[PDB]
Amino acid sequence: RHSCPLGFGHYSVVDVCIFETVVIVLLTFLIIAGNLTVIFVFHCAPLLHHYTTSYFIQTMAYADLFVGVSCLVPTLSLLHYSTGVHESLTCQVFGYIISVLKSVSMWCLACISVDRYLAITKPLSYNQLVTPCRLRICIILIWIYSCLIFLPSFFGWGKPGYHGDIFEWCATSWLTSAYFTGFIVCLLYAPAAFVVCFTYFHIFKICRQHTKEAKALIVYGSTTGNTEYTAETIARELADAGYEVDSRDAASVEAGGLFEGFDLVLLGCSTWGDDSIELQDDFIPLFDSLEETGAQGRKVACFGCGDSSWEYFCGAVDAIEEKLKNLGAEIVQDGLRIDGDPRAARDDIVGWAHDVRGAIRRYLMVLFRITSVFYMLQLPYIIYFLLESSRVLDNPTLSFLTTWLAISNSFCNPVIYALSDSTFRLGLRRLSETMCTSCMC
Numbered sequence: 001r002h003s004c005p006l007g008f009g010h011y012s013v014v015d016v017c018i019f020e021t022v023v024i025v026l027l028t029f030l031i032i033a034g035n036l037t038v039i040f041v042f043h044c045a046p047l048l049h050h051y052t053t054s055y056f057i058q059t060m061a062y063a064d065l066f067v068g069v070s071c072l073v074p075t076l077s078l079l080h081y082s083t084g085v086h087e088s089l090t091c092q093v094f095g096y097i098i099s100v101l102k103s104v105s106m107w108c109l110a111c112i113s114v115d116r117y118l119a120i121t122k123p124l125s126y127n128q129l130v131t132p133c134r135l136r137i138c139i140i141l142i143w144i145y146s147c148l149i150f151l152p153s154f155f156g157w158g159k160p161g162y163h164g165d166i167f168e169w170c171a172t173s174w175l176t177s178a179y180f181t182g183f184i185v186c187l188l189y190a191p192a193a194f195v196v197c198f199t200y201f202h203i204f205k206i207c208r209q210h211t212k213e214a215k216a217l218i219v220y221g222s223t224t225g226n227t228e229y230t231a232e233t234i235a236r237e238l239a240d241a242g243y244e245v246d247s248r249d250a251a252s253v254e255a256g257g258l259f260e261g262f263d264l265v266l267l268g269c270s271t272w273g274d275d276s277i278e279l280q281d282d283f284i285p286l287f288d289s290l291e292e293t294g295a296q297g298r299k300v301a302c303f304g305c306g307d308s309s310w311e312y313f314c315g316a317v318d319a320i321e322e323k324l325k326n327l328g329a330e331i332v333q334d335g336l337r338i339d340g341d342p343r344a345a346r347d348d349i350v351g352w353a354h355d356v357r358g359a360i361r362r363y364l365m366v367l368f369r370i371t372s373v374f375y376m377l378q379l380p381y382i383i384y385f386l387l388e389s390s391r392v393l394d395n396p397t398l399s400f401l402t403t404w405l406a407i408s409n410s411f412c413n414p415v416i417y418a419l420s421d422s423t424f425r426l427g428l429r430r431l432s433e434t435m436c437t438s439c440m441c
């Protein structure tokens with residue numbers, strides 16, 4: 001209370017430590033609001049692509065949310081409007097609950113990697129091996145195991161980390177054990193880091209030695225032939241890449257198991273309707289029975305032709321994207337919306353098709369990135385914890401920065417999802433629309 005984290009050797013019982021306070025108030029609001037929306041997007045999403053990976057992401061989202069709600073207490077201590085009672089107790093609990101959560105996410109990242117490893121190495125075996133029962137067992141085990149590797153903090157085995165250095169009591173009253181540090185390294189950091197390292201090494205080496213012929217389907221609806229030209233343009237672009245393309249007219253296809261077999265599905269539709277958004281006549285039946293196509297888990301993307309003079313430029317691309325999202329499709333890229341003549345927009349269509357080919361690996365890239373940013377944000381804390389448990393270097397400012405740089409990973413996951421996952425961005429947009437509906441009613 002007399003000290004200050006970035007206080008630079010000065011002691012004054014007066015200071016409110018505003019710089020540290022605002023940095024913490026800012027990180028509390030960003031960790032809560034960011035993960036609240038991730039959780040609400042899941043709540044509104046009817047079906048998912050990558051059900052198990054999404055379940056570990058939702059667990060990480062709750063873990064990160066609980067960090068922010070848990071970060072109200074040290075923020076309350078910095079404002080000290082009401083500091084409650086028993087600061088040392090308050091501090092111990094806070095340091096623990098924020099140590100178990102950084103581990104819950106540590107294991108969810110280890111499990112998502114194993115999940116993707118299994119989906120690649122044993123693809124036929126995967127669906128019997130990774131089951132809802134084993135997944136629920138696995139997540140309950142991550143919450144139980146996390147509480148146990150940090151439980152000796154309450155049974156005089158020493159302090160488990162600097163998550164409590166914020167409160168004055170843990171800076172003076174608490175001291176870390178190199179035995180406790182060595183035990184939690186061999187039970188959390190070393191095993192979870194090894195798992196992630198091992199799995200990603202294998203999965204990325206497999207993505208090299210694939211040589212697997214990629215089969216893509218295009219289904220277009222055109223009443224004047226523009227989406228058909230755009231489809232044909234897209235097809236030639238994918239064929240040039242190496243794809244086995246089947247471009248079919250929507251009026252010639254039956255909905256039943258239509259997407260089955262294909263690694264990529266592009267859906268084209270022009271927009272129609274006199275004072276309405278209506279789908280192209282040939283697509284209307286395909287859209288109404290899109291359920292039967294096998295859209296779940298499917299890497300899909302949309303494109304269409306429209307006229308910008310219309311209130312909803314390519315409103316069909318919007319309707320199709322919304323249903324595909326709701327059937328558990330992975331929308332790998334924001335839809336291509338062609339204004340007037342597509343023959344004039346060939347460079348756009350080629351560019352979009354080029355990008356959609358690089359958008360397939362996007363789901364693996366985000367998981368690897370979510371993990372890569374996690375380890376480089378908690379690596380400083382574990383190497384500072386590694387040393388200061390052995391007492392090699394002891395700094396309150398380095399403790400604050402490493403601690404809150406690790407506490408900062410909690411708001412990073414939602415910004416990676418928001419600026420990389422096209423299905424997520426779409427779920428986020430529709431969530432906003434529902435908030436304005438509650439606002440009206």
Ligand SMILES: Cc1cc2nc3c(=O)[nH]c(=O)nc-3n(C[C@H](O)[C@H](O)[C@H](O)COP(=O)(O)O)c2cc1C
Pocket residue numbers: 221222223224225226227228269270271272273274276277278280305306307308310311312313314315340
């Ligand atoms: C009745 C009517 C409604 C239309 N509504 C829209 C619209 O809401 N949004 C849009 O972008 N284009 C709209 N258009 C323009 C068509 O989407 C455009 O002509 C398109 O290039 C047709 O492509 P197709 O050849 O693949 O049918 C409309 C055209 C008609 C005749």
